[PDB]
Every structure is written in structure tokens, then in C-alpha cells.
């Protein structure tokens, strides 16, 4: 069936840019849709960063657009989140999820990856 | 020419096919037609004044 | 402009209805539609969408889960209740920006 | 396209005797016109809605009113079959022409 996988560098020597990789196998990548980045803190609360379609539409937080880059890789059409600075203490989980447009139907979800802001 | 289309009825923000256009005719499916205003009976748009 | 879930640790037994109150400050109801989603999660577990629109059946789970209310208030009704329902449940609006997290109430078993 | 205020335009649209409305525009323009129609009670009963492929999805899909009847092309993205058929037809044409 349609499968997705998320990975990333996670942690290397400091003062670097995380490039978290999200891709989907078994299904077409760039037909319609919403692709959301999701951030969760061990305090059990969620929040939103941004969405990208195939329509080309993009939407991000006004206060968080500073150091977030959504980049393309065409060999399989996987999308990369570039963000500055990775550490260990600020252990938070990140998800990439394709979903029905309008933030309405969360069709798929991410598995979660360790990303830190500290 | 003769492209065979499909028609989608928005059933509570969902993708449901209710008919196939065979290039000359639109053969519908068994699913009822969901009309604007939350109705399933057919409105006829020729209301007099 | 705060969004909450009531309560964090409620009394849940077997067979009755369980009422989770998703209070959203904004006016959710758009053109006669309130964009609600309820989903489950575990710490470190991939979330899965439990129910959508609060009134449309989700493929895989019977009518035990439902949602009522309008505008400022909404209610996840678990009727009846089972034991494995212990999870972090989240209510999410879908009308427009801002995408605002719900209370994410954790279901405890008595 | 890209207009910021056509509420009055939909007003004379509703002034018309008929109750059938049909659209063909871009995704963002369709989203804006759907917002205008929803905020002006133009999505009510009787007003049957038929729209094209360009506006049954994309940005307009969020503000899409209930009861939208859309159309699409079957397998409009499966490129392997498209390119296989194109290769077949072009090879047939080349063979027949050179013969
Ligand atoms: C909307 O457009 C009408 C003309 O059709 C104009 O009279 C009115 O002032 C405009 N209002 C706004 C908020 O643009
Ligand atoms: C739309 O219709 C409803 C119900 O008839 C009414 O309450 C509302 O005022 C109408 N909207 C406008 C802009 O008149
Ligand atoms: C549609 O794409 C899938 C992708 O592998 C392929 O297996 C299938 O044969 C395609 N359908 C047609 C009709 O070519």
C-alpha cells in the first residue's frame, strides 16, 4: 500500500542546518493536496509550522518563517526541511503528514523524529 | 476526442464518483446526488419571478 | 483566544457515554459546517485520525465515537466505551488559520 | 482574475431569473469567489453548482461549498500509460510514413 518515510541527520557537530527528509513510496507524489509539518513537545501539546501542495501553494507561520526552508529533490520528489542549529536537550518530535486539503482531513501522519531548538 | 470523464459528488468533503462520461453520455452511479444546502432531491433552476 | 479540553483526567467506566468538551474560542461553524477532527496518540506513537467532521463515519471504527456541538463548544461522545480507549485524544479545528492544538486530554481508566 | 471585490457582481448574478450557476476560473480565484458566495448566501438550495477540474481542488477546495459536483479525467496523472501510448502512436506514424 501507500507508504511514507521520514528521516534526518538529527544530531551532528553543532552550528549546522538540519535537513529532514520526507518521502512517499507506492503513490504519486505531485498530484493534489496538503503536506504539513507538525511539532510536538514532551508536554503533550501540538503546534503547526507549514503546508505545501502540489498546487504550489505554501503557508507558514509568520513568526517561524525565519529559518525554515522547504526544498525539493526530484529523483523521488522528496521534500527537505532545512532549519538552523541542532542539539540534544530540547528533544521534540517532528512529523511530515500528507492530508486532505483545508486542514480538514488528516489522511496520513508522520512517525516522529528528534529535532531540537536550543 | 472521446475522453471518458468521471463526476465527483462532494459527500461531506469526500471524493465519491457518481457517474462516468463515456464521451457521448454520462452514465450515473447508484449514489444519490448531494446538492448545495444539504439536499438529496433535485432542484430545478428555472424559478419564475 | 484559548482552546481547551475538559477534563484532563476524567472518570471513564465501561458501557456509558464519555464526554470530552473541546472548547474553541473562535466561531468554528462555516457555511453550516463545523470543521472538527478527533484523533488518538501515544507518546512517541504515530497519530491516527479517529473521526472527522464529528458526524461522518470513519472507515474502520463503528459509531462508538461521535461528536456534537457547534461554534464555541464541541463534545466527543464515546458511546459506549471500551478499555483500550486510554490514549491522548486531540480535537482539532479545520476552518482556517491559525491551526490551533486542542487540549489533548489523556484518557485514564478507573 | 485576482479581483478583490465582486460581491456586487454576484448580486446581479442572483438578480437573474435562473438558479443554475457554473464556473471556470483558477484555483485562487475560485477560492475567493467561493468565499464571496458563502458570505452572501449564494450557496443556498436551488443554486445548483457545476464547476470544472481547475476548481474542484487546490486552494478553492477548502472554501468549496457543499453540494459541489465536479469532473475529472480518469487516470489523468498515470504518466507511464500516457508515454507508452504516445510511443506507440509515434512509432506507428514514423513506420507508416517511411514505408
Ligand atoms: C465593493 O464594490 C462596490 C462596487 O461594486 C463598491 O461600491 C464598494 O464600496 C466596495 N466595497 C469594498 C469593501 O470594497
Ligand atoms: C443568510 O440566510 C440566513 C438564514 O436565512 C440568515 O440568517 C442570514 O442573515 C443570511 N445572510 C445575509 C447576508 O443576509
Ligand atoms: C498506473 O500506475 C501504476 C504505478 O505502478 C501502474 O502499476 C499501473 O499499471 C498504471 N495503470 C495503467 C492503466 O497504466
Q: Decide if B18 contacts B28 (C-beta within 8 A).
A: yes
| DSSP SS3 for D86 | helix
Between helix D27-39 and helix D7-15 the angle, nearest 10°, is: 70
| Alpha carbon of C52: minimum distance to chain A alpha carbons (Å) | 7
Q: Decide if A92 contacts A15 (C-beta within 8 A).
A: no
Which chains have at least 3 CB atom pairs separated by less than 8 Å from chain D? A, B, C
Write out chain A residues lying below 8 Å of C49, CB-based. Answer: 105-107, 109
Q: How far is CA C30 from the centre of its chain?
A: 19
Residues 23-42 of D with CB under 8 A from B: none
CA dist C13 and A11 (Å) reads 44
Chain B with chain C: Cβ pairs closer than 8 A: 7
CA dist C57 and C60 (Å) reads 9
Of D27, D61, D77, the CB nearest to A102: D61
Cell 532549519 -> residue = A83
CA dist D3 and D57 (Å) reads 20
Is the CB of D43 less than 8 angstroms away from the CB of C31?
Answer: yes
Q: Around Cβ D95, how many Cβ atoms within 10 Å?
A: 9
| Alpha carbon of D45: minimum distance to chain C alpha carbons (Å) | 12
CA dist D24 and D31 (Å) reads 12
Is the CB of B36 less than 8 angstroms away from the CB of D18?
Answer: no
Write out chain D residues lying below 8 Å of B33, CB-based. Answer: 69
From D7, D9, D13, give the residue whose CB has the most ligand 1 atoms within 8 Å, as the site to mutate: D7
CA dist D33 and D55 (Å) reads 11
Resolution in A: 4.2
Of B5, B12, B44, the CB nearest to D71: B5
Is the CB of B13 less than 8 angstroms away from the CB of C53?
Answer: yes
Best CA proximity match to D57, nearest among B24, C27, A53, C101: A53
Measure the CA dihedral D66/D72/D74/D78, to 10°: -110
CA dist B26 and A46 (Å) reads 46
| DSSP SS3 for D95 | helix
Q: Please state the φ and ψ torsions of residue C51, each to the nearest 5 degrees.
A: -140, 150
Q: Decide if C101 contacts C24 (C-beta within 8 A).
A: no
Amino acid at each position: 500500500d501507500v507508504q511514507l518515510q521520514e528521516s534526518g541527520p538529527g544530531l551532528v557537530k553543532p552550528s549546522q542546518s538540519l535537513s529532514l527528509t520526507c518521502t512517499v513510496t507506492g503513490y504519486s507524489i505531485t498530484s493534489d493536496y496538503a503536506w504539513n509539518w507538525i511539532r510536538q513537545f514532551p508536554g503533550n501539546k501540538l503546534e503547526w509550522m507549514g503546508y505545501i501542495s502540489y498546487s504550489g501553494s505554501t503557508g507558514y507561520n509568520p513568526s517561524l518563517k525565519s529559518r525554515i526552508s522547504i526544498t525539493r529533490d526530484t529523483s523521488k520528489n522528496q521534500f527537505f526541511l532545512q532549519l538552523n542549529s541542532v542539539t540534544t536537550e530540547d528533544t521534540a518530535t517532528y512529523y511530515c503528514a500528507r492530508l486532505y486539503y483545508g486542514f480538514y482531513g488528516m489522511d496520513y501522519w508522520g512517525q516522529g523524529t528528534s529535532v531540537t531548538v536550543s | 476526442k472521446f475522453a471518458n470523464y468521471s463526476i465527483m459528488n462532494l459527500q461531506n468533503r469526500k471524493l465519491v464518483q457518481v457517474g462516468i462520461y463515456n464521451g457521448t453520455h454520462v452514465i450515473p452511479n447508484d449514489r444519490k446526488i448531494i446538492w448545495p444546502g444539504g439536499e438529496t432531491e433535485k432542484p430545478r433552476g428555472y424559478q419564475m419571478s | 483566544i484559548v482552546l481547551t479540553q475538559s477534563p484532563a483526567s476524567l472518570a471513564v467506566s465501561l458501557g456509558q457515554r464519555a464526554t470530552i468538551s473541546c472548547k474553541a474560542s473562535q466561531s468554528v461553524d462555516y457555511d453550516g459546517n463545523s470543521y472538527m477532527n478527533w484523533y488518538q496518540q501515544k507518546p512517541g506513537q504515530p497519530p491516527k485520525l479517529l473521526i472527522y467532521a464529528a458526524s461522518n463515519l470513519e472507515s474502520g471504527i463503528p459509531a462508538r465515537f461521535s461528536g456534537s456541538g457547534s461554534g464555541t463548544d464541541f463534545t466527543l461522545n464515546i458511546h459506549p466505551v471500551e478499555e483500550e480507549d486510554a490514549a491522548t485524544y486531540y480535537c482539532q479545528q479545520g476552518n482556517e488559520d491559525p491551526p490551533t492544538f486542542g487540549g489533548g486530554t489523556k484518557l485514564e481508566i478507573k | 482574475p485576482g479581483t478583490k471585490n465582486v460581491t456586487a457582481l454576484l448580486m446581479e448574478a442572483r438578480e437573474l431569473e435562473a438558479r443554475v450557476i457554473i464556473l471556470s476560473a483558477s484555483e485562487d480565484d475560485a477560492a475567493t469567489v467561493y468565499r464571496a458566495a458563502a458570505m452572501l448566501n449564494m450557496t443556498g438550495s436551488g443554486y445548483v453548482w457545476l464547476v470544472g477540474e481547475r476548481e474542484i481542488s487546490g486552494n478553492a477546495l477548502r472554501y468549496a461549498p457543499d453540494g459541489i459536483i465536479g469532473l475529472q479525467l480518469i487516470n489523468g496523472k498515470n504518466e507511464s500509460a500516457h508515454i507508452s501510448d504516445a510511443v506507440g502512436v509515434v512509432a506507428q506514424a514514423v513506420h507508416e510514413l517511411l514505408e
